[PDB]
From a paper:
DspI is a α/β protein composed of six perpendicular antiparallel β-strands surrounded by eleven α-helices.
The P31 form has six molecules and the P6322 form has only one molecule per asymmetric units. The atomic coordinates from the two space groups were refined at a resolution of 2.10 Å and 2.25 Å. In both crystal forms, the first eight residues have not been modeled because of the poor density in this region. The C-terminal segment (residue 252–272) is further missing in the P6322 form. Although the crystal soaking and co-crystallization did not generate the substrate (or analogue) that bound the DspI structure, the 2Fo-Fc difference map around the active site in the P6322 form allowed us to model an acetic acid molecule in it.
Numbering used by the authors:
A (entry chain B), B (entry chain B), C (entry chain B), D (entry chain B), E (entry chain B), F (entry chain B): 9 to 252
Write the structure that this text describes.
Amino acid sequence: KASSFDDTHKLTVEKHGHTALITINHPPANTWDRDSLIGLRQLIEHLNRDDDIYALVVTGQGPKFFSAGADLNMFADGDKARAREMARRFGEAFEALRDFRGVSIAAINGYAMGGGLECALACDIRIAERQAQMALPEAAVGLLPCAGGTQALPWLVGEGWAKRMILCNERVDAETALRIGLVEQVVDSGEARGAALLLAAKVARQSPVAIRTIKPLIQGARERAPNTWLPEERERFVDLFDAQ
Amino acid sequence: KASSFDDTHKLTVEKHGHTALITINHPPANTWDRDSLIGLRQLIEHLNRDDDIYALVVTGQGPKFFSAGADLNMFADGDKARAREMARRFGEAFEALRDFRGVSIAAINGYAMGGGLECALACDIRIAERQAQMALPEAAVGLLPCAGGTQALPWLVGEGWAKRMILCNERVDAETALRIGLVEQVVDSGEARGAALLLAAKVARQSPVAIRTIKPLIQGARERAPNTWLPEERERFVDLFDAQ
Amino acid sequence: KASSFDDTHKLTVEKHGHTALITINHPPANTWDRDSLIGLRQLIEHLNRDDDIYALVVTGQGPKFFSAGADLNMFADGDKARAREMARRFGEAFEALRDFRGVSIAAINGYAMGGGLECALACDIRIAERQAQMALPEAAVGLLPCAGGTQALPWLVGEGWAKRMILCNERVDAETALRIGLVEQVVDSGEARGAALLLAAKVARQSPVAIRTIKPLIQGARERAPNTWLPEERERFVDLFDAQ
Amino acid sequence: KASSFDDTHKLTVEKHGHTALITINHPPANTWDRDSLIGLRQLIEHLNRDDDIYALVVTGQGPKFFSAGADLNMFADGDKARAREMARRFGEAFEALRDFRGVSIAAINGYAMGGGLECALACDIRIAERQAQMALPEAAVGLLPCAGGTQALPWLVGEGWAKRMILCNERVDAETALRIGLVEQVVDSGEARGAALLLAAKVARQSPVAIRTIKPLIQGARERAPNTWLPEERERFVDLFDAQ
Amino acid sequence: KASSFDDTHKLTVEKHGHTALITINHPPANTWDRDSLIGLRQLIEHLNRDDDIYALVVTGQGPKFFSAGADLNMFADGDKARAREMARRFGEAFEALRDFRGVSIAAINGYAMGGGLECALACDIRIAERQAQMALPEAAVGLLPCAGGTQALPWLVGEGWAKRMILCNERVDAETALRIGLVEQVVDSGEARGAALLLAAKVARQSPVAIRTIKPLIQGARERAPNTWLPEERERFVDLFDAQ
Amino acid sequence: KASSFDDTHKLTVEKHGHTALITINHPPANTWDRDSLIGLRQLIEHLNRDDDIYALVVTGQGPKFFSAGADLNMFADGDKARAREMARRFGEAFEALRDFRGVSIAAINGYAMGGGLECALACDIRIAERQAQMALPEAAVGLLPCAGGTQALPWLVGEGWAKRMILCNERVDAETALRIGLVEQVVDSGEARGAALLLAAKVARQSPVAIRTIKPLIQGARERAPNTWLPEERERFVDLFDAQ
């Protein structure tokens, strides 16, 4: 899928059924840069226009790294202007992945730190390998998680654990992540990608138009309290009842 | 309790102390229909006007089903008009049960799927039997949980598990439900009703006027961020200090 | 730290590195009164103006009590006027502790009930000893948790467990608290203070200006939905990139 | 209307068609006290249960005063406890009048100052006599408009004029009030009551069930942004289409 | 503009510079029906993809009617299903016109009642002819303004005048509309279209990319309080500073 | 007042009673630059710590310009980094002036365009001279009002007139500004400063502690719907009743 456009070779896309497998391919640490952040946004835009795609899996190339976060080549020095543009690209890329019209599954096959973890927080579901370690260590260098980490992390794991990770710089492993809600499924070494593609196959058995309508409803509390969406819930239910 | 009005025989009510035991009695699957959804709303309205009632337990008649959700007799065919009215009745019935002035305890004695699960999400506390299985499989038929499921489920279990259940159609058992926050207590087969009635007895030992005032405060985040309620919290605290 | 001002001897402060150790010293139950609630607010105000302080630990003097909540000497009788002023002092003291510019760690060394538990909910992180028991039993005397308990408790543990504690008056121990998210770390008897001071030392290794900026961002959902803060997140990220 | 219950002789009620004419009768200044604030809330509760009442007019007895605000007999001295209870009674009385299920019309026949003005802000529509003068002069005695004035006044007239009245203690006459949106219609001396009863007669020509449903929708922005109500608008539109 | 697609002859579109002139052409009263509501949404979608279009004017064909609101052919009888679909089409058509990426100007050349008025409320700016009369008389037939009228009308004119129009069924003329904020400019008979096209020409002198970015910011209070957008304001300001 | 610190000679401060008269002194157009935006924030910080100051007037030196907005020396070229810092300084300076603890009065003595108008929108009350002209013409150069103009302007004048000014680049004079709510008082040439200082004297007759408490309440709708502040209103009313 994404068969043709200027897609960076740092992001490989393969079609497996109704599922798009995205692999971060940037050695040695599967780090995110400008080229890949631009390609990610564009790629999500085309997958939202591909009606053959009901699901999405992203994972890191190789067995060691899911993603080590932001390249150092970007928050270089130095340039104040670079930093701002880079924070922009992270938001645009990960908000787009967040707004994927199907379901997105993060197959955490290793270290997911900083921006790599924020990328997985951007996905709908996370599947981590037993040895995987995740953290947001930006405060250690006087910075912060600018790709949504300050909001997404406490959203799943709660404020206590979120500031244990960000404010105290403590990393967590897959089994601790499962205990606190950061991940939904722990699997053995080398089983995330596979596990993710198989969970992405269960989605292709559901009505795609129902998935696309339901998902924004589930994320409703991210912009507005849940009770404010209940009338909208019935309305989209009737919209789904129409057209069988 | 609810000693006299036109209450459908599909909903049996028995008074045990300061507790109203509601039993869904609609074989074979304790399914919800129009008659029972109307009776539920009306029943909650009278229990809110009965000052002898401090608590509430709902459970499914029989050992197999808590509730299998919406009757097929309602989202029949077909009629676009039926579907809309039915989504309305679900909201009105379960929002009323949600707005019960005392505490409500769901004693999940079996399958609670779709609308049956939304009914239990409407209650304050859930107690599940070990063998009980719960899901929201509406997306499998191109529909959605229209009785609050798209908001209530992620509210307790988080977005990851909520779309694991809704978007991926994966069901969960009582022990998984406990791990993710969907239920608060797991008990052995045939022990939910009993467990629920005994938890409903601890409530009758607390000031009822304090329960009625406190409960809306606890649900405050469902309509508005928690910090916006703090001045209101002290105000209702003084209201409780008045009248001893 | 807090080396000089009128600080009540009911609140002892000792400086350990970049960490301020606050100890509730009011026998026999480390109860909160007017004098201590005033001193707490004032103390947090000076710690926010002490740039030598990056973290904060509060704990109860002695091995038995963290804090038994509100003194009876305050919600005395009786005076309607007293009650209101007291609810005010709780809010002001614990909202200030909540708004501490560094990280605050509750070292629960025993019973933390009512206002004592609300004090620990006010802190960023909670570390409980195995034998510690926590509850909000205000509804048992016809009152309510007026120091933020009705909002803070469901915020961490969810609505089900929050009303299990408040509406049903059921207390929880440290291992149950860990299971539900009320605490982040369980430790053995006599190890909380120590554990807390060592977690407070990891914070002094991070940029303080990053901690002060990040923490309000993490608590953003308490006043406004998380998505509304994302542009602000990047903006404060660039503010942190400036000044290296 | 309100034909029988313990209604204080300080509040006279007369039935004119489908309209309830409420007259503040407390010389010399039509001031609000505890007895009248309690009676007002109770009176609105019964008018909401009287299906013969589609509209409501309140005005001051005599030609000189609509209402001079709060009695001095209440924020007496002195008692801290009195003040709090009194602020409570104002809110409860005027929020109830605000939540009247039909339309309420303030016929301002004279001075409406402080609580008298807040009473008229509580009504749906205001009709002022040419000589009428309105202000919120609470800040002049070190207090504030505690019956909703700090929110209702800028809601209609804008922040500039609202703090011109409250923060600068400047009063306005009926013609200035019309220019800024504080009133909707200016009439000649002795014509407000009459004008109000005739506007209240136009309401009795509309579907009452439509008025009761529509009015909360119009006030939707007072609790939540307008766009959040649009799905609810259609839903209540279909509810009105049902039952013809 | 909109040079080619299935556009209903009930909606005529002509290109005048960078401005699209939309004319409701449905005698005798320029009423809105299903065919025209579908065409309106589609038309706005294509104008948002036409980079040659910076502005938009809608007006009624003929000198007598701007729009008399909803056709009777739709809320026919009767069918409950029809009513719901029709409320849906109004929302979708007018929310799209509301979300036009350029500026939209309503040239009110006559009666604009009910849905016709809601259509003009959907536009950015309103220019009314002296003889034009506007109202929302839905409550007179037991219905309500389902195309946003219950939210848009008080948004501009305030609650008092909004329920004077809706709850009391009182219509307003162009000079009263100007006094209350319902319209921004009053012009003489036969001068609205012309006035609107000339105001739409001033827009083509501004940066289009600035108009598209600014307009959502101006409407920010419709979904969220204004202070929550200020960081976003600077961010889009820098986005505009980039690309010159 | 502001008797001693590094205050830029571009901002002259004179003490007249309990009022601080701030005069933008930067020829020829009273334009805002970095030096003056920094000094403004600092100046407001010290006036908030001066208990001798109850009010504030800002106006432009000379008879021709109130303020022509942002210096060209700042959004120079060119530097992307400059633009961002400058948008930051505007927000910080005008949000501080907005958050002045007393009342602030803009005495518009001439042109107030772009940032000059945003400065006056930041004040509580605006008094304009008859010849004064105001606009936000940023969209004409492909930019936007980054100092709050996109939120403050529609907040007072409504969306129609706000986008008439911003999206259509149409300027308004003092008499049009009065008609639409942009200003509260129009005065003759050379009378604004004087008028403002005399309105600032009426404020010094009110309780300062009441002004400081009330003003945030009036601006409550800028961050949260008005109904959410009503319990807080009574609470601060009792806080004002305490301490006489």
